Amino acid sequence: TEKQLSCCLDLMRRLPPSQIEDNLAGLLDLVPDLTEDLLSSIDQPLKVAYDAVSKKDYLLCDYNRDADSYRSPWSNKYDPPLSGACYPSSKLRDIEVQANEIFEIYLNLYFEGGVSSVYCWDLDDNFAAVVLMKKTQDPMRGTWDSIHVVEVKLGKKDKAVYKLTSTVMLSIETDNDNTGKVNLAGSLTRQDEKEYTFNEVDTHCVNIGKMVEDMESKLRQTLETIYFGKTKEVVNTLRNATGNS
Amino acid sequence: ASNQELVQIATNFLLNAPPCEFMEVVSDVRALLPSESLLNASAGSTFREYNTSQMVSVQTSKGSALITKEGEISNNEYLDPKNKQVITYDHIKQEVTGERSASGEIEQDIEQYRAAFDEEATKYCNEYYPNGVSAVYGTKVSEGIKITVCISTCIYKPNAFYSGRWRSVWTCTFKPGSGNVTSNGKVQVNVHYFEDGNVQLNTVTQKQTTSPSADAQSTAVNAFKAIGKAELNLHTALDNNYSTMGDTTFKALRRALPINRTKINWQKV
């Protein structure tokens, strides 16, 4: 129902971001015939899991999920274990391993901590993937969650089009005797499509990294303008500190 | 999954709608309810909770007024001391349905204090809140007199994708003629920006000030000098906080550039 999906998306853009988890579940209860679309177009902060085989942490999202289990990008195994699950094709898995390796580097360079995760899924002869970043800095605390869904459509010979839909979820919260309890929470999305020649030098992972880097660097500046400039601007039009004098 | 569970889900959406966008949220919800009758028993109480906690403003024949819990006489009747009237309000349609003169709701024995405070709240409101609407109530309490000051102002520019509201509720208690006035304030600020996303600022601050309780005129003037100072400081603190957050926690999340100021060489690495 385009009408209901339309109202869900609009509703989620108005409701408090901090209650997104409870609110999304609520919608699923209200309109289960939209469970797939909802789980797909509405994002929220991701939970961290531990891969005991690889001795590394990984991110949980609807992209590495099958039933109630989650696939680890490092071991390619599900937890809890289950039969009949979905795994990337042999060739796509090789790309997934390379992707996870470079983005963990990207993580080190742009976050200096946190956790990363990339999951790929076959789309016939084509494929798509999600690049995930999560970082929490520590009274004043903040949390950053990045999700980049990349869609790759091979184009005849050595040239492919990369479609990117990126979302960054950012929250900062402080509570003191000067300002009282202050909470900033939300997210911003931006898209970008681009064609690239992919070789053994300019691999898909390379083309995805360039697009992810540019996109996340642009969202960063927009986040900064809005979170610390636009909101401030609004408050100051609600209350004129110097007063009409 | 039960009808009542589905009812509680929708109630929570409604109660959490951002300022000035209540109707946009009410539409989305109604369109998600399998049956418009599901909330035909919870609505009134639900909308009333939102309207009064948001301290929405209304237009009467004598000017603007506020719909608050402190001025609530009945489930649909609100007192407006300034214009000596009782406003009947329809919480579901969000519109005034009645206007009459007060006939005893206002406590005359302390009205000189309420009136002296009202003059100050009005000027203060006109000075620091461009679209602000105020409301000053009064009542006798064990310790003497309680004067409640409510201020509420919002903004809505859907074309610019943003909205906001500032709510201040200062409760001033004092023994008439001597002693001090103890003013407890609760300020709440809300901002919603939704262009290609949804970002929200939510604040809740509680403060307490003290000032001399003498002749009505003075008691009011000095209470507002204190209240105005407290809010100025809070406003200042809020402006500073923006910088702190964006210059500390924010930069401590994702660098603008790697430690060696260079965009990754993807061919390598």
Numbering used by the authors:
A (entry chain B): 2 to 139, 146 to 252
B (entry chain A): 2 to 270
Share the article's original sentences.
Capping protein (CP), also known as CapZ in muscle cells and Cap32/34 in Dictyostelium discoideum, plays a major role in regulating actin filament dynamics. CP is a ubiquitously expressed heterodimer comprising an α- and β-subunit. It tightly binds to the fast growing end of actin filaments, thereby functioning as a “cap” by blocking the addition and loss of actin subunits. Vertebrates contain two somatic variants of CP, one being primarily found at the cell periphery of non-muscle tissues while the other is mainly localized at the Z-discs of skeletal muscles.
We here report the first high resolution structure of a cytoplasmic CP. The overall structure of Cap32/34 from Dictyostelium discoideum reveals a similar arrangement as compared to its sarcomeric variant CapZ. Superposition of the two Cap32/34 molecules within the asymmetric unit revealed only small deviations in their overall structures, with a root-mean-square deviation (r.m.s.d.) of 0.3 Å for 512 common Cα atoms. Briefly, Cap32/34 has the shape of a mushroom, comprising a stalk (“N-stalk”) and a cap (“central β-sheet” and “antiparallel H5s”). The mushroom stalk is composed of six anti-parallel α-helices, of which three are contributed from the N-terminus of each subunit (H1–3). The cap consists of a single ten-stranded antiparallel β-sheet formed by five β-strands of each subunit (S6–10). In Cap34 the region located opposite to the C-terminal β-tentacle moves towards the antiparallel helices that interconnect the heterodimer leading to a more compact CP structure. In contrast to the α-tentacle, neither Cap32/34 nor CapZ crystals grown at physiological pH provided an interpretable electron density for the C-terminal segment of the β-subunit (β-tentacle), indicating that this part of the CP molecule is highly mobile. The sequence alignment further reveals that Lys-142 and Lys-143 of Cap32 are C-terminally flanked by three additional residues (Gly-144, Gln-145, Pro-146) resulting in an elongated linker region. Since “linker βS7–S8” provides a positively charged surface close to the basic patch on CP, it might participate in the initial electrostatic binding to acidic regions on the barbed end of actin filaments.
